[PDB]
Design a protein around this ligand. Structure first.
Ligand SMILES: CC(C)[C@H](C(=O)O)[C@@H](O)C(=O)O
Ligand SMILES: CC(C)[C@H](C(=O)O)[C@@H](O)C(=O)O
Ligand SMILES: [Ca+2]
Ligand SMILES: [Ca+2]
Ligand SMILES: [Cl-]
Ligand SMILES: [Cl-]
Lengths: 364, 364
C-alpha cells in the first residue's frame, strides 16, 4: 500500500541535494499515483551535534519502520578530530549495513556522452567510454570479521582485524553479480587476492561454483592490484566487477573517479528482502554546502534506485532516470560538469531539481 | 670485499632482461673496480619445472649466501592452473620476503619527460607530471598474519585471514617513508582504512608517533579508497606514500600503471641489515618472451638499486641510472615506449643493454 521512507540526509550538501531528490520524487509520486510518506532523521555529524552519536536509536528505529532509506552523505571537517569509531561516516554507514544485513552494494559507473573531457583518463581512453557495475559484498569480510581490536603495550602492542567469508556469503553476492551481468554485457570479473588470502581462495572457488547457474555469463578472475591497474587503462573491458568488502570499496571509488563525474553516480546497498539504503556515490562535499552549487543528480538518481529496488516502482524509477538524461542533454548541468570555459552556463542545485522534476511532470 | 649475488631470473622475459642487467653490471664492475660474483638459481615456474617447487631449498640457501638477490620475474600461463599456494609468483616472492625479513618495499614511480603520451592519464594531468615513491610494508599485515585458513563444510564453510600489525612493525616502515620524504619533497602520505580497521587505527597512531622525529616532513593520512581516487586525478600532489602490505600492493601497482611506462620502473625489498631483493615492477610478460622485445631498463635499474642499497656502491648505482637516462634521451627506447607511428624506431632488448652498458663504459 503506502510506502514509508526514512530520509537520512546527513551533512554537507546531503540536505540541499536531498531537497531536489524529494522534489523529483513529488513529481514521480503525482505522475504514477504513488503514496510515499517520508520521515527525516538525523544521521552522521548532525546526529552527533543533535543527539551525541552518528546513528541515534530513534534514527535506527525509523529505518526499521521504513521500506527503504534514502540517505544523503555524512562527515566533514567538524567531526574529523573524533576518535575513529565515533566518527560520522563509519558510525552511520557500517551499523546501518550490519543491522539491516545490506550485504549487496551496487555502484554502476559510466562515462556519459559529452562528459568524456571530465574523465581523468587520457582522451582516447575516455572516448572509448566505459560502463562498469561494481558489485561489492557489504556485510562480511574484514569490515565485520572478529577478532578485531588490540592487545599489548609499547613496541609489541598489536592490533588485528579478521577477514572472514563463508560459502553462503560469497554465493549470495556472486549471484547478484551474475544476474546483473546477464542483463548487461554478460561478463563478471571477480576481484580477489587468491594468491595470498585464504578468504580469496574460497572467494574464487565459490564464485566459480555460482557460475554453473549462469552459462550465458563469462566469468574471469583478477587480483585486486591488477584490477586497479587495468581499470585505469582499459575500463571499457569490464562489465560487472564482483568484489569482497575491502576490495569493492577500493574498486568502486576508483572507477567512479575514472568517470570524472561522481555527482552523477548513485549507490544501492540492499538486503535479500528488498529493503535498502540508497545514496550518492560522492561524499558530503562540506566546502560547497548551502551555496546552491552541489549537483543533485546523484541524490535524485538514488531516489530512482530506491523506487526500483525497494518500492518495486520500476516505471517511476525509469521516469526519473530519463528526466536526468534530459537535463544532461538539454544544457542543465551544474558547474563541476562543465569545462572551465563553459562554467558560466552552470545551473544551481535548485535549477537542476526544478528541471528534472518538470521533465517527470511533462511525461519524459 | 668480494660481493656475492643470487641471480633469480625466473620466467617469461626475466632471463633475457636479466642478461642486459648483468651486461650493464659488467661495465659498472670494470669502471668502478667492483668484484661481484654471481650465481644463478631457478625460481618461480622454471623452478617448478626443474625442481618441483617455486622456491627450491638450494635457491633459498643461495640467497642466504648472497649479499643481495637480483630477481627477474615469475609466473606465466603454464603454471596458472596450479592450486593457489603452489603457484610461482606467490610461492617465490612471499617466502623470500618472510625468510629474509624484507619488510621494506620501495617502488618509486615517475612520469618521464617525453613519455607523457604513454601515461593513461588525461593529457593535462600527465603534462603536470608526477613522482611518487610507494613505501610498502612487506612482511606483516594480512599477508603473514595468523590465523589464516578455513574451517567447516558446505554453506557454512568459511575461510579467514588476519591482518595484524605491532607498533614496532609500523614504526620501522614509517621511519623509512619519512627518511625517504626528507630527501625528496618532504611529504609523507600515510594510507590506511582507520575508519574501519583496528590495524589501521594503530597504523595511523604509530606513524604519527614517528612523525615527531621528522619535523621537516609533512604527514597527512588518507584512506585507501580515497588514495586510489586521488592518484588517478592529481598524482602530482603526492611525494611519499606510506602503506601497509595489502594497501601498498594496490597503490604501488596503481601509480606504476599511471606512469604508462612500467618497463622503466624497479623495486627494492629490503631488510634492516641491507640485504635485499631487487626486481622490475612489471610481470614476466610471457607473451613477449625470447623475442628480443622486452624493455630491460627495469631489470637494469633493479641492478642499480642492488648496488646502492645492498652493496653500498652508490657511484656505480648512479652511473647505471644516468646510462638509462641517456638511452631514453638518445632515441634508445624499446617498442612499448613509442607511440604507434614511432614504433618502427624500436630498439631490441640486446640493443638497449648494449647501449646502456656502452654508456657506463664511456663515463656517463
Ligand atoms: C566510510 C567508510 C566506512 C565507507 C566504506 O569503507 O564502506 C565508505 O568508504 C564507503 O565506500 O561507503
Ligand atoms: C604475487 C603477489 C603475492 C605479490 C604481492 O601481492 O605482493 C605481487 O602482487 C607483488 O606486488 O609483488
Ligand atoms: Ca569508499
Ligand atoms: Ca602487486
Ligand atoms: Cl573484505
Ligand atoms: Cl595488510
Amino acid at each position: 500500500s503506502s510506502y514509508q521512507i526514512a530520509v537520512l540526509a546527513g551533512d554537507g550538501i546531503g540536505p540541499e541535494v536531498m531537497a531536489e531528490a524529494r522534489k523529483v520524487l513529488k513529481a514521480v509520486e503525482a505522475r504514477f499515483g504513488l503514496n510515499i510518506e517520508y520521515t527525516e532523521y538525523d544521521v552522521g555529524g548532525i546526529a552527533i551535534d543533535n543527539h551525541g552519536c552518528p546513528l541515534p536509536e530513534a534514527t535506527l528505529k525509523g529505518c526499521e519502520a521504513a521500506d527503504a532509506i534514502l540517505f544523503g552523505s555524512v562527515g566533514g571537517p567538524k567531526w574529523e578530530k573524533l576518535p575513529p569509531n565515533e566518527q560520522p561516516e563509519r558510525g552511520a554507514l557500517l551499523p546501518l549495513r550490519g543491522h539491516f544485513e545490506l550485504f549487496c552494494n551496487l555502484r554502476p559507473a559510466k562515462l556519459h556522452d559529452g562528459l568524456e573531457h571530465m574523465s581523468p583518463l587520457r582522451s582516447d581512453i575516455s572516448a572509448r567510454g566505459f560502463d562498469v557495475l561494481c558489485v561489492r559484498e557489504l556485510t562480511g569480510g574484514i569490515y565485520f570479521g572478529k577478532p578485531k581490536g588490540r592487545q599489548g603495550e609499547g613496541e609489541s602492542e598489536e592490533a588485528f582485524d579478521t577477514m572472514r567469508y563463508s560459502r553462503r556469503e560469497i554465493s549470495r553476492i556472486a549471484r547478484i553479480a551474475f544476474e546483473a551481468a546477464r542483463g548487461r554485457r554478460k561478463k563478471v570479473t571477480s576481484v580477489d587476492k587468491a594468491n595470498v588470502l585464504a578468504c580469496s581462495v574460497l572467494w574464487r572457488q565459490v564464485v566459480e561454483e555460482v557460475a554453473v547457474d549462469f552459462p550465458d555469463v563469462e566469468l574471469e578472475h583478477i587480483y585486486i592490484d591488477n584490477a586497479t591497474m587495468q581499470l585505469l587503462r582499459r575500463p571499457d573491458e569490464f562489465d560487472v566487477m564482483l568484489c569482497s568488502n575491502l576490495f569493492g570499496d577500493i574498486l568502486s571509488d576508483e572507477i567512479a573517479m575514472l568517470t570524472g563525474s561522481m555527482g552523477l553516480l548513485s549507490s544501492a546497498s540492499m538486503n535479500s528482502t528488498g529493503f535498502g539504503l540508497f545514496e550518492p556515490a560522492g561524499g558530503s562535499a562540506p566546502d560547497i554546502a548551502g551555496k546552491g552549487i552541489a549537483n543533485p543528480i546523484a541524490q535524485i538518481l538514488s531516489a530512482a534506485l530506491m523506487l526500483r529496488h525497494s518500492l518495486k516502482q520500476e516505471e517511476a524509477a525509469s521516469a526519473i532516470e530519463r528526466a536526468v538524461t534530459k537535463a544532461l542533454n538539454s544544457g542543465y548541468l551544474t558547474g563541476e560538469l562543465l569545462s572551465s570555459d563553459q562554467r558560466h552556463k552552470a545551473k544551481t542545485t535548485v535549477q537542476m531539481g526544478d528541471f528534472i522534476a518538470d521533465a517527470v511532470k511533462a511525461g519524459v
